[PDB]
Design a protein around this ligand. Structure first.
Ligand SMILES: [Mg+2]
Ligand SMILES: [Mg+2]
Ligand SMILES: [Mg+2]
Ligand SMILES: [Mg+2]
Ligand SMILES: [Mg+2]
Ligand SMILES: [Mg+2]
Ligand SMILES: [Mg+2]
Ligand SMILES: [Mg+2]
Ligand SMILES: [Mg+2]
Lengths: 169, 159, 68, 292
RNA sequence: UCACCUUGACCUAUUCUCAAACUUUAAAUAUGUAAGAAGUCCUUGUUACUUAAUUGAACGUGGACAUUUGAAUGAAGAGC
RNA sequence: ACAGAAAUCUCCAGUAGAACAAAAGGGUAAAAGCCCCCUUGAUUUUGAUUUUCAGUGUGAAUACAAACCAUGAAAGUGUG
RNA sequence: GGUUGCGGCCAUAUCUACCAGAAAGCACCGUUUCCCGUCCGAUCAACUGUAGUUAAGCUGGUAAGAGCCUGACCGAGUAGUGUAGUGGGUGACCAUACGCGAAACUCAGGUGCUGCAAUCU
């Protein structure tokens, strides 16, 4: 259509929600450090319920956000784990997608003190060129209806390059 | 017991005038107040400093002192059987000019102007205002306007 | 049936034969000229009316016997 | 979705230039509101806005009917001062900041007094009042919606007009050269940025990294072979030309405003009247419900 | 059933009835101020305040205007 | 993925339907709220003012002025 | 007339859907050594207008659009209310006399105006 109307990655985000904090979640940070190459950021707890065992403001999770050429070399490290098979779900109506895998971690060896498993939540945010207008400070606009990302235009993009197939098992 | 605080019974008075909440528009801060100007006191609830007491909302007075963001306004307050001079330190965003005094001062410029061509000729130009005088003679025509109305209507319930 | 219901009430009550059509706010002939015309269509308990206002597509979606 | 009728009726819109994301009215009030015993004294501010491919710089006081521009400068008139490229770098901000100072002072007649800092060193210097002369033209910095960051170009004209002879009150800690470790400006580093040092060193390390990016970037510079070191004399050739003639040459106007209008009055759509909007709805009944 | 006369709420358009401690609106009565000589206009004098700047500010000199001098009615003397 | 109705992550809608120590009312959306940085103006000195009012006192508050600081690029703001 | 910067009044400017924009400006957009900031050059900072584009922003039009704005002898001189009577009525309340006078509804019309600067086949 337009050379500025082509679906792009914005950001891949890598989530692990540990049910506790302490010695365990430092290792959950280090596994998500080496996948990204970036130092990762922790997330606290929004509240406490006395039924899930997590207490408010105790840093019970990690995530990291990767953008650009580095981010497109992390997707396929979890896509062959997922066997290139996404479902009728996994897709937002806004045009993004993600999935949840476990234990790819044989690839990317550090010293590897193998005590534990860290499953991890893939999610990627799609955009198009011109997404600056919502995040820039001055004249903070809104993306129009035509140029906004849709659920179809990303499942028409996933069945494009990265060559997968959808809804099946 | 009974409550007689400063902002007591000010529930609707200091309210913010539907769909005109938010910031104070900048013409309020660009208005110029000189000593002797006659100003209407209307408290803006969104500014809590320099805010007049509830007695002075809607009162009109004369600027006597000018400080950085505030005018000093003199109000006459009836206390018992006499009036006492009240001196109020109000910031200029509770204050607007009285539009009557702009209407007066143009009439002063008008009466000066109308008396000028009273000095060219024809003295005593009759420049005082007069009330609504009684109407004069008329002759009401009927061409195309013949007088017609019928009678009072009967009683119907029309539910 | 309403004359017997007066006795259960204090005060004084009247039996006014209304000139409206049923539980509506328009008279019997005014409701008729709205009825051969297409500004009248059924609801659950009441009747919806057509206006010269709003989108023409919604004036077509509901009320399609009109514009004939 | 579903912005209902009760939602729209109760919505209070932001002003227009809060709805345009173009004005902070929180900052505007504090910049503009004059001391009331300084009755009609206009409080002047230095507007420094940075767009893509331009620097816009103005001297503005405020009236009730709207703002008033005393003196304006642009970086797109730097071509006649000898700056044909680098019009949104840090140093054209100094160049526009220097020009708007010297354009204002000759406009107000105070140009011979208050020459400012003549030879530029990047010493943190403030315009001092001449004793038994007029006070210098007090103007405050409006950075607008841009962020106060150490080394930003919005503080480029802050050094540009302070040395240009305008009394702009400031600290120095947003110039290139401040340290969070030692609370002290680095005047040697700041001396580079005014004369385009931070642009000039990038050429000399792109001389030694790759000619690929040195052919994409500075592609204009390759075409007219300005030396990688010759920037400091380009800017001095303009910093002298500004103080020689800041007088605001206008431009040609080139098919003037009466025929500019009719040139841009043939691509603007016409709002209709009732007689055709009724005709369109009268058409739309036969179009939508003409029994197929 | 292992997509069904015997679905609850929820959403959309309707409908009847209301509010001292609800409200977009909004009276009547009551209420503040103004309707000038302590005024207006012109000239420009002072200052340590204020202005980039006698610029403003405030108070003035000198000059211009006299009772239709700046609505109505009254005033019984006014002020202390 | 575990993970469900509620763990974290991501987008869309969100005029405030939240929050602002404590009741209720008022006020607030590039903030008065949330996060971060710096600080002690919750300072000194004397008058003026507002409310309760006898125009006494007490308490609370508003605007200044001389300082001295904080703060910020700055305009500013701060006498809890 | 367009556009940009700074605005004034702050929806006639807002919101929803669809369609156009010549030039110019604006924007998206290219890169990360430096100043600077981040989990991450998306924000922010810095750089060249260089690789490209009007796709978005943005402006404008369309809509028996929602909303908003104005007017009406539209409701309606209505509801309410001031004043008066040794008026009515058992009372509740009501009628009259001299005045003041809405709102909701309903139709009609509209959909930013303007200031300072600068530039634009
Ligand atoms: Mg109380
Ligand atoms: Mg700011
Ligand atoms: Mg009551
Ligand atoms: Mg009353
Ligand atoms: Mg609290
Ligand atoms: Mg409360
Ligand atoms: Mg007390
Ligand atoms: Mg970038
Ligand atoms: Mg009597």
């Amino acid at each position: 259509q337009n050379p500025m109307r082509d679906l792009k990655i914005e950001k891949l985000v890598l989530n692990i929600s540990v049910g506790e904090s302490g010695d365990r979640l430092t290792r959950a940070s280090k596994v998500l450090e080496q996948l990204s190459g970036q130092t990762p950021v922790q997330s606290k707890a929004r509240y406490t319920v006395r039924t899930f065992g997590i207490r408010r403001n105790e840093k019970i999770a990690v995530h990291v956000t990767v953008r650009g050429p580095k981010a497109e070399e992390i997707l396929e490290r979890g896509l062959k784990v997922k066997e290139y098979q996404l479902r009728d779900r996994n897709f937002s109506a806004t045009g993004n997608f993600g999935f949840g895998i476990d234990e790819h971690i044989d690839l990317g060896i550090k010293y590897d003190p193998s005590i534990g498993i860290f499953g991890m939540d893939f999610y990627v945010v799609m955009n198009r060129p011109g997404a600056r207008v919502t995040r820039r400070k001055r004249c903070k606009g809104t993306v129009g209806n035509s140029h906004k990302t849709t659920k179809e235009d990303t499942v028409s993009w996933f069945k494009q390059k990265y060559d997968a197939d959808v809804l099946d098992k | 017991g009974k409550s007689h605080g400063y902002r007591s019974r000010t529930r609707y008075m200091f309210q913010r005038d539907f769909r005109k909440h938010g910031a104070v528009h900048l013409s309020t801060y660009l208005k110029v107040y000189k000593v002797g100007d006659i100003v209407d006191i209307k408290a803006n609830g969104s500014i809590q400093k320099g805010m007049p007491h509830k007695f002075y909302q809607g009162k009109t007075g004369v600027v006597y002192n000018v400080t950085k963001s505030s005018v000093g306004v003199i109000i006459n307050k009836m206390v018992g059987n006499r009036y006492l001079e009240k001196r109020l330190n109000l910031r200029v965003e509770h204050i607007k000019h009285s539009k009557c005094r702009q209407e007066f001062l143009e009439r002063v410029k008008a009466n000066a102007a109308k008396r000028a061509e009273a000095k060219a000729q024809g003295v005593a130009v009759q420049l005082k205002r007069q009330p609504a005088q009684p109407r004069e003679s008329r002759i009401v025509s009927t061409e195309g306007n013949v007088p017609q109305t019928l009678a009072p209507v009967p009683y119907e319930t029309f539910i | 049936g309403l004359r017997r219901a007066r006795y259960k009430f204090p005060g004084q009550q009247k039996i006014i034969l209304s000139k409206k059509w049923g539980f509506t706010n328009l008279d019997r002939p005014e409701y008729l000229k709205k009825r051969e015309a297409g500004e009248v269509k059924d609801d659950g308990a009441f009747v919806k009316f057509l206006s010269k206002k709003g989108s023409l597509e919604n004036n077509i979606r509901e009320f399609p016997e009109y514009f004939a | 979705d579903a912005k209902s009728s009760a939602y729209s009726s109760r919505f209070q819109t932001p002003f227009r230039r809060r709805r345009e994301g173009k004005t902070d009215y929180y900052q505007r009030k504090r910049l503009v509101t004059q001391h009331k015993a300084k009755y009609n004294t206009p409080k002047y501010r230095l507007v420094v806005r940075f767009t893509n491919k331009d620097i816009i710089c103005q001297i503005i006081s405020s009236t009730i009917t709207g703002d008033v521009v005393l003196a304006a400068a642009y970086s797109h008139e730097l071509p006649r001062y000898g700056i044909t490229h680098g019009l949104t770098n840090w140093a054209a901000a100094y160049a526009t900041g220097l020009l708007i100072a010297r354009r204002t002072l000759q406009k107000l007649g105070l140009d011979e007094t208050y020459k400012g800092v003549e030879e530029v060193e990047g010493e943190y210097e403030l315009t001092e009042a001449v004793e038994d002369g007029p006070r210098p033209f007090k103007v405050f910095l409006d950075i607008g919606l841009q962020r106060t960051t150490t080394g930003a170009r919005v503080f480029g004209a802050l050094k540009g007009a302070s040395d240009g002879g305008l009394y702009v009150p400031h600290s120095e800690n947003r110039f290139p050269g401040w340290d969070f470790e030692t609370e002290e400006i680095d005047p040697e580093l700041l001396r580079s940025y005014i004369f385009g040092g931070h642009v000039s060193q990038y050429m000399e390390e792109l001389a030694d990294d790759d000619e690929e990016r040195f052919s994409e970037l500075f592609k204009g510079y390759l075409a007219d072979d300005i030396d990688a070191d010759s920037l400091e004399d380009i800017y001095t050739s303009a910093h002298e030309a500004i103080r020689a003639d800041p007088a605001f040459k206008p431009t040609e106007k080139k098919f003037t405003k009466e025929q500019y209008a009719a040139e841009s009055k043939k691509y603007r759509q016409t709002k209709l009247s009732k007689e055709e909007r009724a005709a369109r709805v009268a058409a739309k009944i036969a179009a939508l419900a003409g029994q197929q």
